[PDB]
């Protein structure tokens, strides 16, 4: 019953592939619902057309700032929302987790881990995992850099809910 969402990724405007996620609504319903709604666009805003602005190989891909550089984004709740819980841990590649600016400042930015990142446990709310297309995340990762700047424009060309 956990929702599935997809991103169709493009690189300098050229199709790359689809990444799909399981969202752990059974665990973290408020956080899963935020990401689900932003992916469908059903509130009038969300992830379609946004970019992955920070990619560090071996670490994570970060996106969801739909100011396009890590300073913006907003939740579906009209303000930034609380850390729902830290039940789920950063256990390896594919983990989907909320970016934030300190305790209880969740908006729309998220990251996809490409490694185990246990130092983030208890700081960032894990709320999903890649289900299909981890290979597409691995292809995206190669356009990142040590300081996170991407060498090509990585975009969510389309997104929505599956099944």
From Swiss-Prot:
Q: Which residues carry this modification: Phosphothreonine?
A: 91
| Sites bearing Phosphoserine, chain numbering | 75
| Species of provenance | Homo sapiens
Which GO terms of the molecular function aspect are on file? cyclosporin A binding; heparan sulfate binding; integrin binding; peptidyl-prolyl cis-trans isomerase activity; RNA binding; unfolded protein binding; virion binding
What family, per the record? Belongs to the cyclophilin-type PPIase family. PPIase A subfamily.
Q: Keywords for this entry?
A: Acetylation, Apoptosis, Cytoplasm, Glycoprotein, Host-virus interaction, Isomerase, Isopeptide bond, Nucleus, Phosphoprotein, Rotamase, Secreted, Ubl conjugation
Q: What does the record say about activity regulation?
A: Binds cyclosporin A (CsA). CsA mediates some of its effects via an inhibitory action on PPIase.
Q: Which residues carry this modification: N-acetylvaline?
A: 1
InterPro entries in UniProt: Cyclophilin-like_dom_sf (IPR029000), Cyclophilin-type_PPIase (IPR024936), Cyclophilin-type_PPIase_CS (IPR020892), Cyclophilin-type_PPIase_dom (IPR002130)
| Record Pfam families | Pro_isomerase
**Gene3D superfamilies reported for this sequence:** Cyclophilin-like (2.40.100.10)
In the UniProt annotation, what is the result of changing residue 111 to A? Answer: Reduced ability to stimulate MAPK/ERK phosphorylation
Q: Specify the protein name.
A: Peptidyl-prolyl cis-trans isomerase A
Domain of life of the native organism: Eukaryota
Give residue numbers for the modification (N6-acetyllysine): 27, 43, 74, 80, 123, 129, 131
PPIase cyclophilin-type domain location: 6-161
Q: Describe the processing and modification events after translation.
A: Acetylation at Lys-123 markedly inhibits catalysis of cis to trans isomerization and stabilizes cis rather than trans forms of the HIV-1 capsid. PPIA acetylation also antagonizes the immunosuppressive effects of cyclosporine by inhibiting the sequential steps of cyclosporine binding and calcineurin inhibition. Acetylation at Lys-123 favors its interaction with TARDBP.
Quaternary data: Interacts with protein phosphatase PPP3CA/calcineurin A. Interacts with PRPF19 isoform 2 (via N-terminus). Interacts with isoform 2 of BSG/CD147. Interacts with FOXO1; the interaction promotes FOXO1 dephosphorylation, nuclear accumulation and transcriptional activity. Interacts with integrin ITGA2B:ITGB3; the interaction is ROS and peptidyl-prolyl cis-trans isomerase (PPIase) activity-dependent and is increased in the presence of thrombin. Interacts with MAP3K5.
Q: Where is this cross-link: Glycyl lysine isopeptide (Lys-Gly) (interchain with G-Cter in SUMO2)?
A: 27, 80
Q: Where is this cross-link: Glycyl lysine isopeptide (Lys-Gly) (interchain with G-Cter in ubiquitin)?
A: 27
What result is annotated for mutating residue 105 to A? No effect on peptidyl-prolyl cis-trans isomerase activity. Reduced interaction with BSG/CD147 and ability to induce leukocyte chemotaxis
Which biological process terms from the Gene Ontology are attached to this UniProt entry?
activation of protein kinase B activity; apoptotic process; cell adhesion molecule production; cellular response to oxidative stress; endothelial cell activation; leukocyte chemotaxis; lipid droplet organization; negative regulation of oxidative stress-induced intrinsic apoptotic signaling pathway
User: Which SUPFAM superfamilies would you find in this protein's record?
Assistant: Cyclophilin-like
């Amino acid at each position: 019953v956990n929702p599935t969402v997809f991103f169709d990724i493009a690189v300098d405007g050229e199709p790359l592939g689809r990444v799909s996620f399981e969202l752990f609504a059974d665990k973290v319903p408020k956080t899963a619902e935020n990401f689900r709604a932003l992916s469908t666009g059903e509130k009038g805003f969300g992830y379609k057309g946004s970019c992955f602005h920070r990619i560090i190989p071996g670490f994570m891909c970060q996106g969801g700032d739909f100011r396009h550089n890590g300073t913006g984004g907003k939740s579906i709740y009209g303000e930034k929302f609380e850390d729902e819980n830290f039940i789920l841990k950063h256990t390896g590649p594919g983990i989907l987790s909320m970016a934030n600016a300190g305790p209880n400042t969740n908006g729309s930015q998220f990251f996809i881990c490409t490694a185990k990142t246990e130092w983030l446990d208890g700081k960032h709310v894990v709320f999903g995992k890649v289900k299909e297309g981890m290979n597409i995340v691995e292809a995206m990762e190669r356009f990142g850099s040590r300081n996170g700047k991407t060498s090509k424009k990585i975009t969510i060309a389309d997104c929505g809910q599956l099944e």
